[PDB]
Scaffold this motif. Structure first.
Motif, PDB file in Angstrom:
ATOM      1  N   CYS A 144       0.819  -1.202   0.000  1.00 52.96           N
ATOM      2  CA  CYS A 144       0.000   0.000   0.000  1.00 52.96           C
ATOM      3  C   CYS A 144       0.853   1.253   0.000  1.00 52.96           C
ATOM      4  N   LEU A 170       0.012   4.187   0.853  1.00 52.28           N
ATOM      5  CA  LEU A 170      -0.713   5.243   1.542  1.00 52.28           C
ATOM      6  C   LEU A 170      -0.741   5.113   3.052  1.00 52.28           C
ATOM      7  N   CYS A 201      -7.739   6.345   1.979  1.00 47.11           N
ATOM      8  CA  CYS A 201      -7.679   5.202   1.084  1.00 47.11           C
ATOM      9  C   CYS A 201      -8.097   5.583  -0.323  1.00 47.11           C
TER      10      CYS A 201
HETATM   11  S1  SF4 Z   1      -6.960   0.212  -1.072  1.00 47.22           S
HETATM   12 FE1  SF4 Z   1      -5.883   1.423   0.382  1.00 47.22          FE
HETATM   13  S2  SF4 Z   1      -4.553  -0.268   0.733  1.00 47.22           S
HETATM   14 FE2  SF4 Z   1      -5.668  -1.483  -0.687  1.00 47.22          FE
HETATM   15  S3  SF4 Z   1      -4.316  -0.805  -2.255  1.00 47.22           S
HETATM   16 FE3  SF4 Z   1      -5.626   0.890  -2.644  1.00 47.22          FE
HETATM   17  S4  SF4 Z   1      -4.558   2.113  -1.199  1.00 47.22           S
HETATM   18 FE4  SF4 Z   1      -3.226   0.434  -0.839  1.00 47.22          FE
END
Ligand code: SF4
Ligand code: CLA
Ligand code: CLA
Ligand code: CLA
Ligand code: CLA
Ligand code: CLA
Ligand code: CLA
Ligand code: CLA
Ligand code: CLA
Ligand code: CLA
Ligand SMILES: CC1=C(/C=C/C(C)=C/C=C/C(C)=C/C=C/C=C(C)/C=C/C=C(C)/C=C/C2=C(C)CCCC2(C)C)C(C)(C)CCC1
Lengths: 731, 175, 61, 119, 80, 31, 27
Positions: free
Chosen positions: E20, E22, E47
């Motif tokens: 991820c 983020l 997200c």
């Molecule tokens: S959803 Fe949140 S965690 Fe799952 S991939 Fe897209 S950003 Fe990374």
């Protein structure tokens, strides 16, 4: 409620431009709003039905008004072969000078109404413009009635209860009796009182329709069952439609077949026809229980059909529950049945032309068929699209515990594998034979072709009396059981219409019928491979079994697990819309190139040059677009210059679709950032800042808008080519 | 029972202007909420009194300039002498005003239950136009009963055609 | 249950639903999905080795 | 912009004047002692965190989320701990009892404001 | 916001958090697995929903599922 | 045949109705 | 074929337009 989507707060919080597009495209999605429960749903779709019906009757009052006011309707009644049926007039301020000379037909500059409307209004018995005005007001009143009801059943104490909506039991007691049975009976009350006498010369307008009985003796000595008097003296041979010469006076004579002169069905046949259909539907209205209690409980009609053979699961126990609680199942059956009805309409408007002096104008007949076929395919694809919406957002396999539906989802693998098999087989055995015939014809040798006689269709035409093949079976043989069995009743008036090669009924058949009808079945089986695929794999596949959780038109699953472009149940729509336009494509190219060989006369021009593909791209697209694409020249123009414009226009629609279909979002989502950088940074425009943030179209919308330009470009191109082609070779 | 009849004691009504009693033998006021049916009863009784006075007053022989009547039914001569004049279209159209303009929200006052569902105002009378207790009910019963006898009596005024084919004055000149 | 036993699965969302596979690991340490099972064929993530509980774990003989 | 949108201010320290790459694009000078960096969105900032951390030791770094009312937040690090490393302070949210295999069918969630996994 | 829910297949192999970009997902000590770890998604307001987690989620079928929910400023990921 | 009516209605519905209706719908986004 | 019936027509569909906006501002 706060902003825009006064209905969804999940989109009113969105600052982008997606709140606009999804605010539009989820407006009618009544099952997914803020707090709209079941009573608040049926009490909204029931009102919007009335708004819809009032839009329909506003539209038909539109046709009544323009034909009443700008058309040439009674001048067309004077000479229905000669004068072209005029549509509404034109007001362009863009027609400079040379355009107006290419549209003047009398004082009017109107369009030529290529929609068959004057024929149907001429067989109804409308012989004036005055009746068109009284009818147009008669449907403005009716649209005000329907808008009054939809406004009226959203007034709060007149919003009907849901137990009334779940009187599923008795709508069929009233639709089959009142809507279908009575009104068609009422339509005989038109045809007996208007179309028969105003076809037999008697102007029975709204005055003498109670003082002039349509039979000279009627209904006081006719409750006694002497009903052969109403079929006593038919209109035999020597009659022109509209006058009183050579015509009898019987009402319900079932001759069968056509007019000799106008090549349309007898209105006695339609009066007797809708009368019999009326009686049988009114009998079918007495089918189910009500407050009285003489009928059929539907639970006792789906519960009882569990076979003791045991092969068909635990029977239909569970189906009646998932039609009351469901709607997309009920809408899927509605669009299925309406769609097969439209294709039946299309396959009978040309074959048994109902309207006098149709099959004499060869453009309106060519537009009605293509019209109801593209509408036919649209409504099938609606039936499967709401099929997949039923299997996602409406399906309960615990009320459907090992039901017939759960059995369908059990063997959906065999279903999709065998649809893919027959579609593969037909696709290697139409394209194989067309590329065989096209290579072989290309190599200086039309003889070494594979031509298979379609003997099954020739044998079925032999079962309906087409004696031009030499099978001599049930109706082609004049000595068989069915040939003697209706020898007086309807055969000799009908086999004349069959064995004739002028009319478009039971056409003469070469191997183009074979290879094309296999191509059509390829289109049906591919399109049901897609639709039945993403309607049965609508809920969960072995790629992603989470699909039922994401709703209908979720975009994707990302690149994970190999890549997941278009997994949704909306893809089956999205791809089988291409196959819809394609399949209805081949249907209407085939029909239209069959009848440009009949109407020209050279049937050998078809049958020699349709068994291979350059027969189509040569003898049909390259040749019949010649009066189209000469719609305006550097020497001038003519009346076809609209269609030849529209044609080109529609190509520009179609290929713009490819910009959305081929090239997807993340190009544009990082290009709008360059545009918003350039707008923010520049002087004299950084004052004018957006409120909704500029964002490229989401990848469900983008595939949808590319599909919409594909449809509009496709259908406008082919509506340009049907009308400009037949209107260029004729009129 | 409350009915002066076989038996149904106060199914849903009983205070309405039935001076001889509440009739209601069949299950309409069971489930129809009764305000709708009362507005329909009063509107039908008004228009039927207009119908019967139309038939009688026309059977006293009056025309501006038209044909001989011989009937006040049987559409072509009477009715489509009038329609082909372009004349009944407006006498329908103003009622097409009246019901949609001042009858439809009036019927919305027959939705909520705040109307006494007759009541288009309209008393241009002095000394006898009582809106209160006595003469409003005992005269509203007069409009009600004379409207019901207008409904049936207009039924017979229509249906004297088969053995008659003449005027109802000519029916009075026959037995 | 035991290591190396050929095991069909009864959880409808696995890629190997109704396909037998060999047990690599059985853990006795209160793990909700203790039994690491790998397979012959391979799902979309390129990953045959997954893990399961005991209810979705049918051995053969 | 800075008048209405959240500017993300990545602050970090180093040891040598190296050269990293901006998420805007192009190389940056990389002040050796301590340096801030105002950015646009979070993926740019943590993409710079991966841009630095997968190269070499750049730790004691985190974005202060400048939101236009004025105050800051603490992204990335949150708890002096690296996020895939396990600290016993992070309280879990966002789990259910089982796999997808026990999620309810959306015909049970139909006409209710629930989700297809809530149980 | 994109509701990220992390089911009980999560054996705590941390390719989700490391995948991820983020930091919406962290690791939480959870004594139900062999590694004792199970991911969490507290800051789903940040997200994006790019589903780069579900690429690198080596469970049987996707312990971590990213349901596409609302679309705020940050969840749309626009630069300006 | 009131031939002058398209010279009124075709502009006042063809152009000025998708001006003021753009105003009504687009301000109606923010109402 | 006349002009007055056209005026009557746009009167009736103007009223029908008032029912269109009337139904439209309730759902
Ligand atoms: S959803 Fe949140 S965690 Fe799952 S991939 Fe897209 S950003 Fe990374
Ligand atoms: C299915 C039911 C049905 C439908 C759709 C129609 C439709 C029509 N009828 Mg009609 N009609 C019907 C039943 C029906 N009728 C019955 C049952 C009778 C017998 C009472 C009549 C008697 C009748 C007459 C006498 C006339 C029409 C006329 C018309 C046309 C114009 C009506 C108008 O201005 O308003 C229209 C196509 C008029 C027409 O066609 O003009 C010549 C006309 O003069 N109808
Ligand atoms: C006798 C009583 C009666 C009648 C006439 C109707 C009539 C209608 N109801 Mg209805 N209804 C009734 C009783 C009745 N209902 C009762 C008792 C209940 C409660 C149990 C309901 C509950 C109910 C609901 C819940 C709904 C309706 C709806 C409708 C409308 C259907 C849409 C439509 O116009 O299709 C018209 C269809 C046809 C005319 C036929 C179509 C198919 C045929 C086979 C093809 C056409 C024939 C021919 C070939 C083509 C002619 C065309 C010409 C150009 C040649 C229609 C006006 C729906 C609606 O739209 O709301 C208004 C709706 O949602 N009704
Ligand atoms: C629902 C449609 C309908 C309606 C409203 C009427 C209405 C009428 N018909 Mg009728 N009629 C109809 C269908 C209808 N008919 C059909 C389908 C047939 C063919 C079987 C007839 C055959 C018929 C005859 C033969 C006679 C009538 C007559 C009449 C009139 C007096 C009874 C009355 C106006 C009588 C009359 O005077 O004609 C106007 C009369 O003699 N009708
Ligand atoms: C009477 C028939 C009927 C009814 C009631 C519905 C009803 C519904 N459908 Mg639907 N559908 C139908 C027929 C019908 N459909 C048919 C025949 C098809 C096949 C073509 C479909 C295909 C279809 C799909 C694929 C989807 C629906 C969905 C829906 C639901 C929401 C629709 C919505 O919000 O749209 C809002 C209104 C619009 C988007 C306006 C339509 C504008 C379209 C997209 C383009 C038209 C523009 C036009 C061509 C441009 C003019 C320019 C000119 C040059 C031509 C709703 C229950 C959706 C759903 O349930 O998923 C959640 C969904 O995804 N339907
Ligand atoms: C020219 C355009 C074209 C062609 C030929 C096809 C053909 C096909 N599509 Mg299709 N499709 C198209 C456009 C086209 N599509 C478009 C625009 C869309 C919208 C995106 C779709 C969407 C679509 C869907 C959604 C589905 C199909 C499916 C199919 C297959 C149907 C089964 C069948 O007929 O197999 C017969 C096979 C053929 C007709 C293939 C052609 C034969 C080839 C040319 C010969 C073999 C190669 C030859 C020896 C040359 C060698 C090359 C050289 C380099 C060595 C078939 C391959 C379905 C499928 O998989 O069915 C099983 C399916 O589900 N299509
Ligand atoms: C499975 C693919 C398939 C499909 C969908 C169709 C579909 C159709 N065919 Mg048909 N056809 C097929 C295969 C197929 N055909 C084959 C293989 C042949 C032999 C070459 C024919 C020969 C044929 C003729 C002569 C005619 C049609 C016609 C038609 C149309 C009307 C329905 C009909 O007569 O059924 C026909 C149904 C079948 C022949 C059964 C097909 C199912 C099996 C599985 C196909 C494979 C059989 C296999 C090759 C034979 C084994 C060897 C055997 C000789 C020992 C319809 C479009 C008629 C038409 O065009 O009128 C519009 C028509 O006249 N077909
Ligand atoms: C997904 C695409 C999309 C969508 C749906 C919208 C939607 C919207 N934008 Mg927008 N925008 C987008 C992309 C998009 N934008 C992009 C990519 C940019 C560049 C960064 C902008 C930049 C932008 C600015 C700068 C502004 C908007 C504004 C608006 C709103 C008013 C409509 C408007 O100004 O356009 C209407 C269409 C045009 C202006 C077209 C201009 C070119 C035409 C063809 C020339 C005119 C010729 C002729 C005289 C027209 C006469 C006929 C006509 C009056 C009917 C509307 C909500 C305005 C806003 O929010 O104010 C409240 C605003 O100020 N947008
Ligand atoms: C449009 C037709 C219509 C309608 C809607 C009504 C409706 C009503 N009538 Mg009624 N009525 C009618 C025609 C009609 N009537 C006719 C033609 C007659 C003369 C036979 C009567 C004679 C009549 C009597 C004698 C009584 C009613 C009463 C009633 C009320 C309750 C009982 C019921 O459902 O009946 C209800 C308001 C009863 C009432 O109002 O309660 C006091 C009552 O006593 N009616
Ligand atoms: C759908 C409705 C519609 C209507 C009614 C018109 C009408 C007109 N267009 Mg037009 N147009 C339209 C859609 C429409 N357009 C669309 C969709 C496009 C984009 C493809 C264009 C693109 C277009 C171009 C590129 C041009 C026109 C022009 C014209 C004018 C023709 C010049 C002429 O010979 O008249 C004789 C001319 C006159 C009598 C002078 C009239 C001048 C204006 C219009 C009247 C005064 C306006 C007033 C100050 C403001 C009042 C409000 C206003 C909005 C009306 C005419 C007024 C031409 C033009 O600009 O003419 C001015 C022109 O060059 N149009
Ligand atoms: C997804 C889905 C769906 C679907 C849809 C549709 C679309 C369907 C299909 C269907 C269809 C689309 C239909 C069709 C049908 C068929 C038929 C119907 C056929 C048959 C035929 C016949 C029957 C004929 C024959 C004959 C003749 C020829 C003559 C003589 C006699 C007879 C009649 C026998 C549904 C809703 C269901 C369910 C849910 C889901």
């Amino acid at each position: 409620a706060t902003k825009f989507p006064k209905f969804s707060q999940a989109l009113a919080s969105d600052p982008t431009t997606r709140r606009i597009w999804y605010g539009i495209a989820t407006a009618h999605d009544f099952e997914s709003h803020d707090g709209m429960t079941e009573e608040n749903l049926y009490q909204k779709i029931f009102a919007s039905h009335f708004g819809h019906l009032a839009i329909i009757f506003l539209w038909t009052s539109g046709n009544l008004f323009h034909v009443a006011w700008q058309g040439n309707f009674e001048q067309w009644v004077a000479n229905p072969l000669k004068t072209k049926p005029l549509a509404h007039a034109i007001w362009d301020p863009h027609f400079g000078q040379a355009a107006l000379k290419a549209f003047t037909r009398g004082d009017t500059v109107a369009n030529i109404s290529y929609s068959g409307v004057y024929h149907w209004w001429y067989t109804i018995g409308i012989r004036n413009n005055v009746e068109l005005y009284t009818g147009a007001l008669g449907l403005l009143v009716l649209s005000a009635v329907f808008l009054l009801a939809g406004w009226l059943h959203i007034q709060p104490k007149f919003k009907p209860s849901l137990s009334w909506f779940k009187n599923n039991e008795s709508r069929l007691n009233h639709h089959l009796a009142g809507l279908f049975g009575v009104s068609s009976l009422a339509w005989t009350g038109h045809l007996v009182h208007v179309a028969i006498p105003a076809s037999r010369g008697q102007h029975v307008g709204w005055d003498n329709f109670i003082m002039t009985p349509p039979h000279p003796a009627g209904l006081q000595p006719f409750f006694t069952g002497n009903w052969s008097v109403y079929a006593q003296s038919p209109d035999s041979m020597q009659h022109v439609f509209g006058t009183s010469q050579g015509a009898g006076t019987a009402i319900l004579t079932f001759l069968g077949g056509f007019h000799p002169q106008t090549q349309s069905l007898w209105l006695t046949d339609m009066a007797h026809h809708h009368l019999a259909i009326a009686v049988i539907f009114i009998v079918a209205g007495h089918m189910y229980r009500t407050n009285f209690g003489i009928g059929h409980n539907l639970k006792t009609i789906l519960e009882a059909h569990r076979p003791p053979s045991g092969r068909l699961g635990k029977g239909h126990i569970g189906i009646y529950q998932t039609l009351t609680n469901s709607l997309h199942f009920q809408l899927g059956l509605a669009l299925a049945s309406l769609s097969v009805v439209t294709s039946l309409v299309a396959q009978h408007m040309y074959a048994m032309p109902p309207y006098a002096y149709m099959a004499f104008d060869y453009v309106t007949q060519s537009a009605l068929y293509t019209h109801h076929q593209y509408i036919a395919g649209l409504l099938i694809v609606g039936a499967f699209a709401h099929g997949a919406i039923f299997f996602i957002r409406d399906y309960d396999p615990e009320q459907n515990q090992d039901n017939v539906l759960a059995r369908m989802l059990a063997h959906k693998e065999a279903v999709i594998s065998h649809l893919s098999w027959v579609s593969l087989f037909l696709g290697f055995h139409t394209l194989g034979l067309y590329v065989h015939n096209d290579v072989v014809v290309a190599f200086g040798n039309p003889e070494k072709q594979i031509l298979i006689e379609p003997i099954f269709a020739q044998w079925i035409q032999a079962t309906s009396g087409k004696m031009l093949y030499g099978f001599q079976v049930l109706l082609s043989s004049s000595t068989s059981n069915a040939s003697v069995a209706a020898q007086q009743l309807w055969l000799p008036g009908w086999l004349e219409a069959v064995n004739n090669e002028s009319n478009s009924l039971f056409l003469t058949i070469g191997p183009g019928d074979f290879l094309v009808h296999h191509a059509i079945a390829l289109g049906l089986h591919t399109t049901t491979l897609i639709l039945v695929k993403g309607a049965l794999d609508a809920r969960g596949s072995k790629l992603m079994p989470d699909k039922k959780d994401f709703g209908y038109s979720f975009p994707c699953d990302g690149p994970g697990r190999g890549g997941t472009c278009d997994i949704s149940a909306w893809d089956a729509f999205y791809l089988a819309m291409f196959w819809m336009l394609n399949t209805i494509g081949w249907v209407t190219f085939y029909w239209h190139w069959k009848h440009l060989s009949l109407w020209q006369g050279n049937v050998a021009q078809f049958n020699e040059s349709s068994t291979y593909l350059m027969g189509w791209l040569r003898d049909y697209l390259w040749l019949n677009s010649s009066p189209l694409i000469n719609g305006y020249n550097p020497y001038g123009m003519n009346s076809l210059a609209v269609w030849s414009w529209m044609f080109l226009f529609a190509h520009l629609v179609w290929a713009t679709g490819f910009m959305f279909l081929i090239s997807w979002r993340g190009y544009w989502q990082e290009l709008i950032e360059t545009l918003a950088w350039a707008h923010e940074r520049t002087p004299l425009a950084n004052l004018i800042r957006w409120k909704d943030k500029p964002v490229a179209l989401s990848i469900v919308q983008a595939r949808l808008v590319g599909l919409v330009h594909f449809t509009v470009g496709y259908i406008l191109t082919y509506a340009a080519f049907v009308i400009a082609s037949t209107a260029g070779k004729f009129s | 029972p409350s009915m002066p009849f076989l038996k149904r004691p106060s199914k849903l009504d009983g205070s309405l202007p039935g001076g001889e009693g509440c009739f209601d033998p069949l299950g309409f006021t069971e489930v129809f909420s009764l305000e709708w049916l009362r507005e329909a009863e009063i509107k039908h009784c008004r228009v039927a009194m207009l119908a019967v006075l139309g038939v009688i007053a026309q059977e006293f022989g009056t025309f501006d300039f038209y044909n001989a009547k011989s009937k006040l039914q049987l559409s072509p001569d009477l009715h489509n002498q009038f329609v082909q004049n372009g004349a009944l279209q407006q006498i329908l159209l103003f009622v097409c005003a009246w019901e949609f303009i001042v009858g439809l929200p009036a019927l919305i006052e027959s939705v909520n239950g705040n109307r006494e569902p007759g009541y288009f105002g309209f008393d241009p009378l002095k000394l006898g136009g009582t809106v209160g207790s006595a003469q409003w009910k005992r005269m509203q019963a007069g409009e009600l009963r004379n409207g019901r006898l207008a409904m049936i009596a207009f039924g017979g005024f229509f249906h004297q055609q088969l053995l008659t084919k003449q005027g109802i004055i000519e029916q009075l000149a026959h037995f | 249950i035991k290591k190396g036993s050929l095991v069909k699965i009864l959880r409808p969302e696995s890629f190997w639903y109704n396909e037998v596979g060999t047990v690599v690991n059985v853990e006795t340490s209160k793990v909700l999905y203790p039994v690491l099972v790998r397979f012959d064929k391979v799902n979309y993530s390129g990953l045959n080795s997954t893990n399961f509980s005991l209810d979705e774990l049918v051995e053969i003989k | 912009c800075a008048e209405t949108e959240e500017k993300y201010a990545m602050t970090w320290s180093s040891d040598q004047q190296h050269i990293f790459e901006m998420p805007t694009g192009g190389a940056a000078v990389m002040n050796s002692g301590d340096n801030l960096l105002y950015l646009a969105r979070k993926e740019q900032a943590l993409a710079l965190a991966t841009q630095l951390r997968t190269q070499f030791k750049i730790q004691d770094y985190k974005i202060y989320r400048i939101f236009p009312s004025g105050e800051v937040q603490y992204l990335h690090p949150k708890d002096g701990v690296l996020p895939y490393q396990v600290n016993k302070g992070r309280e879990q949210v966002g789990r259910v009892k089982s796999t997808i295999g026990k999620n309810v069918n959306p015909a049970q969630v139909k006409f209710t404001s629930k989700a297809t996994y809530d149980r | 916001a994109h509701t990220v829910k992390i089911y009980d297949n999560c054996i705590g192999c941390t390719q989700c958090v490391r995948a991820c970009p983020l930091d919406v997902l962290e690791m939480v000590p959870w004594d139900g697995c062999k590694a004792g770890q199970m991911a969490s998604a507290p800051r789903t307001e940040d997200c994006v929903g790019c589903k780069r987690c579900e690429t690198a989620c080596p469970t049987d079928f996707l312990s971590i599922r990213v349901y596409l929910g609302g679309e705020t400023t940050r969840s749309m990921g626009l630069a300006y | 045949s009131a031939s002058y009516l398209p010279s009124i209605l075709v502009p006042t519905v063809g152009l000025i109705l998708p001006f003021a209706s753009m105003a009504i719908l687009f301000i109606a986004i923010e109402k | 074929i006349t002009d007055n019936q056209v005026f009557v027509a746009l009167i009736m569909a103007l009223v029908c337009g008032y029912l269109a906006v009337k139904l439209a501002k309730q759902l």
